[PDB]
């Protein structure tokens, strides 16, 4: 039985709130290894947060993580927690529990925003090669998925990483290049899925 750490699911919070993340362990004697926590900020490095002793229950924090951060345990449940108080936008990150350098969890994603859940609007980017696409505007939170023609069209497809607008909503576009000779014969549909808002859109993109 291989070591297993199960981390709680994606977290969406507003500034000022509190979040408690869980790490559920099995496949070994819980009190044999300390649990470490690691913060990964998107597009940036890794920051070690500190650790908790699973025998004693004593937490040790890295300097940048004193005050708003707390590690704790429920030993009878082989579980470790990270709690963050008084959330700030900048707590937005993925958090990994780990048994040192060796065994990591899949991570827990935390988004801190004053924005409220919202489904995108899908607009066409109308077109020997032509480009066309779909503009997926003003949604929150991430992610959206885009495919083209139910997934049958993959070659030449670029779906851009989303950008955060000032409004606090995200926005992205997805494009594909196809033969210009096909604009008259082949229909192009972008399929947009935004699960948080349960929004599914199919948009026909035709030349004008």
């Amino acid at each position: 039985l291989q070591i297993q750490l199960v981390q709680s699911g994606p977290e969406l919070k507003k500034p000022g709130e509190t979040v408690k993340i869980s790490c559920k362990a099995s496949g070994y004697t819980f009190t044999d290894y300390s649990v470490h926590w690691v913060k990964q900020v998107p597009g940036k490095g890794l920051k070690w947060m500190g650790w908790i002793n699973t025998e004693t229950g004593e937490p040790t924090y890295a300097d940048d993580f004193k005050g708003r951060f707390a590690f704790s345990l429920e030993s009878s449940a082989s579980t470790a927690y990270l709690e963050i108080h008084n959330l700030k936008n900048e707590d937005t990150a993925t958090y990994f529990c780990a048994l040192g350098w060796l065994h990591w969890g899949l991570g827990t994603t935390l988004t801190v925003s004053s924005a409220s859940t919202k489904g995108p609007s899908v607009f066409p980017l109308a077109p020997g090669t032509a480009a066309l696409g779909c503009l997926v505007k003003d949604y929150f939170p991430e992610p959206v998925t885009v495919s083209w023609n139910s997934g049958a069209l993959t070659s030449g497809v670029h779906t851009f990483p989303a950008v955060l607008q000032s409004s606090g909503l995200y926005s992205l576009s997805s494009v594909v290049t196809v033969p210009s000779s096909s604009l008259g014969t082949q229909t192009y549909i972008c399929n947009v899925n935004h699960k948080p808002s349960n929004t599914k859109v199919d948009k026909r993109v035709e030349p004008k």
């Binding site: 470490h36 990964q40 490095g45 890794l46 920051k47 070690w48 500190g50 040790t60 890295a62 300097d63 993925t94 990994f96 040192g100 350098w101 060796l102 990591w104 899949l106 991570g107 609007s121 607009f123 066409p124 980017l125 109308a126 090669t129 480009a131 696409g133 503009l135 505007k137 670029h158 779906t159 851009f160 990483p161 989303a162 950008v163 607008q165 926005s171 992205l172 576009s173 494009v175 290049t177």
Partner: protein
């Protein structure tokens, strides 16, 4: 209890496929434990959008399920990660970790990409759709498609006036097949502003272009 700096270099790297890649991690304190003769240094690979993955531990020991083209070496304060023959799937950020003293510290990472021949982008401009215009906003999209290297400049001109502060850019990860990048620039204007002017253009400057290329459109054609 002692602050240890790890310094990784170079900070970013571009190698041709199949060639050797070398990256360094120097520590401010020796990571060598005289008790057991182990260096408490580990290397991780982290691919765009993924969690970190342990490649080698105790400086030189390859983790199982790590291709043998990865080799960790060095001792004390100087450590090296070598990729004997770089592959497209090696596109990632590489971090070293010291766990000799608390607090544990990561290096700043080395970004690895594939170098390929220079390739000019294909530029496309997209006017706002009539449907978006109905909601009081107008997004104009410029697309730079399949180019290398990554560095590119895009600027918007409305009625030949240079724009500033109103556009946003996004770049794909390196394509695993043709090793290129693509980029979108999105110019955002109120329906109001958009009706005011007539000529919308984006100008692209890239090493693959003998001179800056421009695509443009006139509102209402």
């Amino acid at each position: 209890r002692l602050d240890i700096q790890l310094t990784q270099s170079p900070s970013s790297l571009a190698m041709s496929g199949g060639q050797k890649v070398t990256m360094r991690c120097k520590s401010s304190q020796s990571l060598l434990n005289s008790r057991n003769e182990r260096n408490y240094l580990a290397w991780y690979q982290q691919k765009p959008g993924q969690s970190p993955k342990l490649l080698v531990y105790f400086a030189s020991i390859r983790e199982s399920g790590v291709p043998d083209r990865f080799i960790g070496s060095g001792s004390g304060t100087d450590f090296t990660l070598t990729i004997s023959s770089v592959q497209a799937e090696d596109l990632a950020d590489y971090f070293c970790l010291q766990h000799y003293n608390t607090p544990w510290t990561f290096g700043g990472g080395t970004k690895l990409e594939i170098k390929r021949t220079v390739a000019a982008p294909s530029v496309f401009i997209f006017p706002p759709s009539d449907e978006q215009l109905k909601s009081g906003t107008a997004s104009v999209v410029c697309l730079l498609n399949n180019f290398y290297p990554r560095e590119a400049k895009v600027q918007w001109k409305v009625d030949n006036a240079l724009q500033s502060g109103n556009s946003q850019e996004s770049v794909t990860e390196q394509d695993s097949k043709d090793s290129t990048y693509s980029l979108s620039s999105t110019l955002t204007l109120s329906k109001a502003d958009y009706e005011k002017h007539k000529v919308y253009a984006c100008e692209v400057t890239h090493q693959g272009l003998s001179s800056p290329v421009t695509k443009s459109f006139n509102r209402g054609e």
